[PDB]
Design an enzyme around this catalytic site. Structure first.
Site, PDB file in Angstrom:
ATOM      1  N   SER A 144       0.809  -1.226   0.000  1.00 49.04           N
ATOM      2  CA  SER A 144       0.000   0.000   0.000  1.00 49.04           C
ATOM      3  C   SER A 144       0.834   1.264   0.000  1.00 49.04           C
ATOM      4  CB  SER A 144      -0.900   0.024   1.227  1.00 49.04           C
ATOM      5  OG  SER A 144      -1.560   1.262   1.297  1.00 49.04           O
ATOM      6  N   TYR A 169      -1.280   0.935  10.163  1.00 52.35           N
ATOM      7  CA  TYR A 169      -1.618   0.184   8.951  1.00 52.35           C
ATOM      8  C   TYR A 169      -0.468   0.229   7.948  1.00 52.35           C
ATOM      9  CZ  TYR A 169      -3.510  -0.712   4.312  1.00 52.35           C
ATOM     10  OH  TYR A 169      -3.682  -1.152   3.037  1.00 52.35           O
ATOM     11  N   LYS A 173       2.273  -2.980   6.675  1.00 46.00           N
ATOM     12  CA  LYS A 173       2.635  -3.310   5.285  1.00 46.00           C
ATOM     13  C   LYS A 173       4.145  -3.357   5.081  1.00 46.00           C
ATOM     14  CE  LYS A 173      -1.299  -4.116   3.917  1.00 46.00           C
ATOM     15  NZ  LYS A 173      -1.694  -5.322   3.146  1.00 46.00           N
TER      16      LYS A 173
HETATM   17  N1  LIG Z   1      -8.803  -1.040  -0.599  1.00 52.55           N
HETATM   18  C1  LIG Z   1      -7.732  -0.339  -0.981  1.00 52.55           C
HETATM   19  O1  LIG Z   1      -7.813   1.009  -1.368  1.00 52.55           O
HETATM   20  C2  LIG Z   1      -6.390  -0.989  -0.992  1.00 52.55           C
HETATM   21  C3  LIG Z   1      -5.282  -0.208  -1.273  1.00 52.55           C
HETATM   22  C4  LIG Z   1      -4.011  -0.672  -0.939  1.00 52.55           C
HETATM   23  C5  LIG Z   1      -3.850  -1.920  -0.342  1.00 52.55           C
HETATM   24  N2  LIG Z   1      -4.947  -2.670  -0.067  1.00 52.55           N
HETATM   25  C6  LIG Z   1      -4.739  -4.003   0.497  1.00 52.55           C
HETATM   26  O2  LIG Z   1      -5.347  -4.931  -0.398  1.00 52.55           O
HETATM   27  C7  LIG Z   1      -5.916  -6.023   0.303  1.00 52.55           C
HETATM   28  C8  LIG Z   1      -7.405  -6.252   0.046  1.00 52.55           C
HETATM   29  O3  LIG Z   1      -8.087  -5.030  -0.057  1.00 52.55           O
HETATM   30  P1  LIG Z   1      -9.703  -4.920  -0.012  1.00 52.55           P
HETATM   31  O4  LIG Z   1      -9.977  -3.493  -0.331  1.00 52.55           O
HETATM   32  O5  LIG Z   1     -10.180  -6.001  -0.905  1.00 52.55           O
HETATM   33  O6  LIG Z   1     -10.158  -5.205   1.519  1.00 52.55           O
HETATM   34  P2  LIG Z   1     -11.291  -6.301   1.886  1.00 52.55           P
HETATM   35  O7  LIG Z   1     -11.653  -6.324   3.328  1.00 52.55           O
HETATM   36  O8  LIG Z   1     -12.431  -6.195   0.938  1.00 52.55           O
HETATM   37  O9  LIG Z   1     -10.617  -7.720   1.552  1.00 52.55           O
HETATM   38  C9  LIG Z   1      -9.629  -8.302   2.360  1.00 52.55           C
HETATM   39  C10 LIG Z   1     -10.130  -9.694   2.656  1.00 52.55           C
HETATM   40  O10 LIG Z   1      -9.292 -10.268   3.615  1.00 52.55           O
HETATM   41  C11 LIG Z   1     -10.082 -11.017   4.521  1.00 52.55           C
HETATM   42  N3  LIG Z   1      -9.322 -11.198   5.763  1.00 52.55           N
HETATM   43  C12 LIG Z   1      -8.908 -10.250   6.660  1.00 52.55           C
HETATM   44  N4  LIG Z   1      -8.212 -10.885   7.634  1.00 52.55           N
HETATM   45  C13 LIG Z   1      -8.156 -12.210   7.344  1.00 52.55           C
HETATM   46  C14 LIG Z   1      -7.569 -13.298   7.988  1.00 52.55           C
HETATM   47  N5  LIG Z   1      -6.676 -13.101   8.961  1.00 52.55           N
HETATM   48  N6  LIG Z   1      -7.702 -14.557   7.420  1.00 52.55           N
HETATM   49  C15 LIG Z   1      -8.400 -14.720   6.234  1.00 52.55           C
HETATM   50  N7  LIG Z   1      -8.981 -13.634   5.615  1.00 52.55           N
HETATM   51  C16 LIG Z   1      -8.854 -12.412   6.164  1.00 52.55           C
HETATM   52  C17 LIG Z   1     -11.376 -10.268   4.656  1.00 52.55           C
HETATM   53  O11 LIG Z   1     -12.387 -11.166   5.030  1.00 52.55           O
HETATM   54  C18 LIG Z   1     -11.528  -9.706   3.250  1.00 52.55           C
HETATM   55  O12 LIG Z   1     -12.294 -10.558   2.437  1.00 52.55           O
HETATM   56  C19 LIG Z   1      -5.657  -5.741   1.759  1.00 52.55           C
HETATM   57  O13 LIG Z   1      -4.506  -6.502   2.022  1.00 52.55           O
HETATM   58  C20 LIG Z   1      -5.382  -4.245   1.840  1.00 52.55           C
HETATM   59  O14 LIG Z   1      -4.475  -3.925   2.866  1.00 52.55           O
HETATM   60  C21 LIG Z   1      -6.202  -2.226  -0.389  1.00 52.55           C
HETATM   61  O1  LIG Z   2     -16.166  10.808   4.523  1.00 57.36           O
HETATM   62  C1  LIG Z   2     -14.996  10.878   4.149  1.00 57.36           C
HETATM   63  C2  LIG Z   2     -14.203   9.727   3.995  1.00 57.36           C
HETATM   64  C3  LIG Z   2     -12.879   9.869   3.577  1.00 57.36           C
HETATM   65  N1  LIG Z   2     -12.342  11.166   3.314  1.00 57.36           N
HETATM   66  C4  LIG Z   2     -10.939  11.353   2.847  1.00 57.36           C
HETATM   67  O2  LIG Z   2     -10.862  10.739   1.507  1.00 57.36           O
HETATM   68  C5  LIG Z   2      -9.461  10.505   1.210  1.00 57.36           C
HETATM   69  C6  LIG Z   2      -9.380   9.024   0.793  1.00 57.36           C
HETATM   70  O3  LIG Z   2      -9.702   8.195   1.874  1.00 57.36           O
HETATM   71  P1  LIG Z   2      -9.801   6.549   1.813  1.00 57.36           P
HETATM   72  O4  LIG Z   2     -10.059   6.021   3.178  1.00 57.36           O
HETATM   73  O5  LIG Z   2     -10.684   6.125   0.691  1.00 57.36           O
HETATM   74  O6  LIG Z   2      -8.360   6.016   1.311  1.00 57.36           O
HETATM   75  P2  LIG Z   2      -6.974   6.404   1.934  1.00 57.36           P
HETATM   76  O7  LIG Z   2      -6.429   7.559   1.166  1.00 57.36           O
HETATM   77  O8  LIG Z   2      -7.064   6.433   3.417  1.00 57.36           O
HETATM   78  O9  LIG Z   2      -6.201   5.120   1.519  1.00 57.36           O
HETATM   79  C7  LIG Z   2      -5.265   4.462   2.350  1.00 57.36           C
HETATM   80  O10 LIG Z   2      -5.976   3.271   2.783  1.00 57.36           O
HETATM   81  C8  LIG Z   2      -6.271   2.300   1.724  1.00 57.36           C
HETATM   82  C9  LIG Z   2      -6.700   0.978   2.367  1.00 57.36           C
HETATM   83  O11 LIG Z   2      -7.907   1.178   3.107  1.00 57.36           O
HETATM   84  C10 LIG Z   2      -5.081   1.969   0.807  1.00 57.36           C
HETATM   85  F1  LIG Z   2      -4.208   1.131   1.454  1.00 57.36           F
HETATM   86  C11 LIG Z   2      -4.325   3.213   0.324  1.00 57.36           C
HETATM   87  O12 LIG Z   2      -3.131   2.795  -0.375  1.00 57.36           O
HETATM   88  C12 LIG Z   2      -4.010   4.196   1.498  1.00 57.36           C
HETATM   89  O13 LIG Z   2      -3.546   5.437   0.978  1.00 57.36           O
HETATM   90  C13 LIG Z   2      -8.720  10.987   2.486  1.00 57.36           C
HETATM   91  O14 LIG Z   2      -8.546  12.405   2.432  1.00 57.36           O
HETATM   92  C14 LIG Z   2      -9.754  10.723   3.561  1.00 57.36           C
HETATM   93  O15 LIG Z   2      -9.429  11.428   4.750  1.00 57.36           O
HETATM   94  C15 LIG Z   2     -13.150  12.318   3.468  1.00 57.36           C
HETATM   95  O16 LIG Z   2     -12.727  13.455   3.238  1.00 57.36           O
HETATM   96  N2  LIG Z   2     -14.474  12.154   3.886  1.00 57.36           N
END
Ligand SMILES: NC(=O)c1ccc[n+]([C@@H]2O[C@H](COP(=O)([O-])OP(=O)(O)OC[C@H]3O[C@@H](n4cnc5c(N)ncnc54)[C@H](O)[C@@H]3O)[C@@H](O)[C@H]2O)c1
Ligand SMILES: O=c1ccn([C@@H]2O[C@H](COP(=O)(O)OP(=O)(O)O[C@H]3O[C@H](CO)[C@H](F)[C@H](O)[C@H]3O)[C@@H](O)[C@H]2O)c(=O)[nH]1
Ligand SMILES: NC(=O)c1ccc[n+]([C@@H]2O[C@H](COP(=O)([O-])OP(=O)(O)OC[C@H]3O[C@@H](n4cnc5c(N)ncnc54)[C@H](O)[C@@H]3O)[C@@H](O)[C@H]2O)c1
Ligand SMILES: O=c1ccn([C@@H]2O[C@H](COP(=O)(O)OP(=O)(O)O[C@H]3O[C@H](CO)[C@H](F)[C@H](O)[C@H]3O)[C@@H](O)[C@H]2O)c(=O)[nH]1
Lengths: 366, 363
Positions: A144, A169, A173
């Protein structure tokens, strides 16, 4: 070119999209180990046998080529060594692990770090141990942009920029990138860490995405607001921080599409597959995944406004704990080494697929 | 000043020294959790109720003001959820945790990281979780100079940039972020103590690091002398590092000076409460500020033993930074730390005294 891929967290938002891509555009065999903690304990959206059969059933146009492709579902927690070892044995031998399980609420990680250090770090540690035990030498880990945090000049962050996480968080990572890296020299494990920036969008079929209820992310939370401007007559859209060092006070971010991210994993899988003992200074690599074009919270909301045709009034608040000011990807390395071409370049087209999903799912997969 | 302390890894080399000090220089109550994974599975040397009464019995002359003091010993892994809670239940309430348990071979860490990541990292997490559950809010952590790695010359500042050369260095580092984070989230007060190269034995000459199976220079060196009296050639790992003499330069600090820093650190955390702030997480480097290369150590060993210590030069041991010496102003200025030892010669004397009278360790 066949491989048996185990996908941890494969039932989540990003996970579902990767799985889809595996099923549709690879000959790979898929095992999802997911605990359902991030999916309200349900697995209806998961493309099991078994679930894909019930989709081919109710409704039909012309039977598509991917129709019999399905994933196994092992449900349980990767921290459970007993269950995980069973999964590797029963479904093996596993060729590669795609590690996508985590807790991911940046704001929450600051207030309850033990919860993050436990799941995220201990989870990965168990995977690597299982891999070792079962002669499995390849891993793609979901990293991330949260690893970078703020500079000690705000412009596209390359793979090697300084790592000062601003949240537990982000820490978790980075710790995992280190563990994985250290397994390279020690055990010959072949790891690619993929630093996604801001996952967004939904599959073009409009049937899987991130529903706004319980969501902590921007775009889901807007669309969620739109879904209640709609419903039968505080309401406004919260902005977290307007006093950041940015051209408009709002955090800037790089919104990459879950399908482009999905295709990066397939390239990554392919790249680790072809690595020989000859190398082996390439056994560990990293890649930043993003569009490279940035948008500010205010700019995002505007695109929602034009995409949905809705007013979306705003409402400014205090910064969320653990948010950098700027996180935009430089993706050169991914494009050179993996030959990654992200199909979605603009947020408008991404926003479209996010809306299409949400607007058709007033209650989620429920 | 009466406080109840859990010492994890208290059966170990540094632990035994810190405990004696707790027993003799303070009124703190003392509980030891240790799996005995580093003491070859035995506790004869631990100052329990049984063992402190036997010292009394073999002993001639007037009892010291500490002849009755002793620690409780609990045998098991801190990673075992049930066992830890057991220990916190019985011996509770626990006012401070002193976390000294870990695996610690810099070399082994490079060859086998997950072993270190599991133990070092999972270990501190369990503690932090168990501290949280049982409402304990003060921790003293055993850190290491290994968190600094090489620069990007001078004794090392607490806030020098940290780039670990080894998985062992990494694991100590990540625990520091874990503990820092825990101050902010839950108001745990935490002191991270970056020990340098731990050396010496206690003046009584009954305890210290035995040479058999040791991974440390000074024990390995005196090991060779024992091997000869009680290649046999003493290996030098690398002669091509960028230091004046080509061999790694380290900072050897007496276990007793380390011990007394903890007692200072305990007084420092207890003297905080609600009415505070940002004093909640703090770090201290602990060394003598004198650097000695491998060659120089062997010289001091050579003088202390009368023995020739014939030597052979090998390649580098992976994970070794070139230079690791402490700058300890902050440890002195804020805790009031005064290391009683300074030069390696006097420190080496305590080491050898122990080692020459212990042909077979504790058995
Ligand atoms: N969502 C984003 O913007 C984004 C950005 C950067 C990194 N990531 C990373 O990508 C991955 C997935 O993202 P997402 O948005 O799909 O989140 P998500 O919650 O939809 O999916 C993650 C999945 O992991 C499962 N999980 C959590 N802990 C577990 C455990 N210990 N054993 C088995 N399953 C478990 C949850 O049930 C879920 O289905 C995460 O590792 C997150 O840190 C997400
Ligand atoms: O009601 C809201 C909700 C969010 N935000 C803002 O919207 C932006 C984006 O927020 P997100 O939570 O969607 O995503 P982040 O930027 O926090 O993402 C971080 O968390 C993600 C995982 O949840 C990924 F890991 C990603 O790489 C990392 O930058 C930030 O300014 C956040 O503070 C608002 O202003 N109002
Ligand atoms: N030895 C040094 O040069 C020095 C220098 C810097 C840092 N340190 C750190 O200080 C501490 C003291 O080290 P030491 O020299 O006494 O080595 P040691 O092995 O003698 O001390 C560690 C003790 O903890 C116990 N232990 C290990 N894992 C355990 C587990 N999970 N559960 C319960 N007990 C466990 C071992 O049995 C041993 O008694 C260690 O944390 C080490 O990393 C030591
Ligand atoms: O047989 C040997 C043994 C050691 N050495 C050299 O002696 C120096 C010290 O070695 P140790 O392993 O005894 O001590 P370290 O400097 O590796 O200690 C490191 O690990 C220690 C715990 O094991 C502490 F954490 C300390 O902070 C950290 O510097 C190193 O250059 C090592 O390569 C030799 O030349 N021959």
């Amino acid at each position: 070119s066949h491989m048996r891929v185990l996908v941890c967290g494969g039932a989540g938002y990003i996970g579902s999209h990767f799985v889809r891509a595996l099923l549709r555009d690879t000959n790979h065999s898929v095992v999802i180990v997911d605990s359902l903690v991030g999916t309200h304990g349900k697995s209806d959206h998961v493309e099991t046998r078994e679930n894909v059969a019930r989709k081919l059933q109710q409704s039909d146009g012309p039977k598509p080529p991917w129709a019999d492709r399905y994933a196994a579902l092992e449900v349980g927690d990767v921290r459970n060594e007993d269950f995980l070892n069973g999964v590797f044995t029963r479904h093996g031998p596993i060729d590669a692990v795609v590690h996508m399980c985590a807790f991911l609420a940046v704001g929450e990680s600051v207030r309850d770090p033990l919860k993050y250090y436990d799941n995220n770090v201990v989870g990965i540690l168990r995977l690597l141990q299982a891999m070792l035990l079962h002669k499995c030498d390849k891993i793609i880990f979901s990293s991330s942009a949260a690893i970078f945090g703020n500079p000690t000049n705000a412009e596209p962050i390359d793979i090697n920029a300084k790592k000062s996480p601003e949240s537990p968080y982000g820490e978790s990572k980075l710790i995992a990138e280190r563990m994985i890296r250290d397994c390279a020299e020690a055990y010959g494990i072949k790891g690619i860490c993929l630093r996604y920036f801001n996952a967004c969008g939904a599959h073009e079929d409009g049937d899987i995405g991130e529903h706004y209820q319980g969501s902590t992310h921007l775009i889901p939370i807007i669309l969620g607001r739109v879904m209640s401007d709609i419903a039968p007559d505080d309401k406004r859209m919260p902005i977290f921080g307007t006093d950041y060092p940015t051209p408009d006070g709002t955090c800037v971010r790089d919104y990459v599409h879950v399908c482009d991210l999905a295709s990066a994993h397939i390239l990554a899988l392919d790249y680790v597959e072809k690595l020989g003992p000859n190398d082996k200074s390439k056994y560990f690599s990293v890649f930043n995944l993003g569009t490279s074009r940035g948008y500010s919270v205010r700019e995002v909301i505007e695109v929602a406004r034009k995409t949905t045709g809705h007013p979306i009034p705003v409402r400014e608040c205090g910064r969320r704990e653990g948010d950098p000011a700027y996180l935009v990807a430089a993706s050169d390395k991914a494009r050179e080494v993996l030959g990654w071409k992200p199909k979605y370049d603009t947020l408008e087209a991404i926003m479209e697929t996010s809306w299409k999903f949400q607007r058709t799912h007033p209650n989620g997969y429920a």
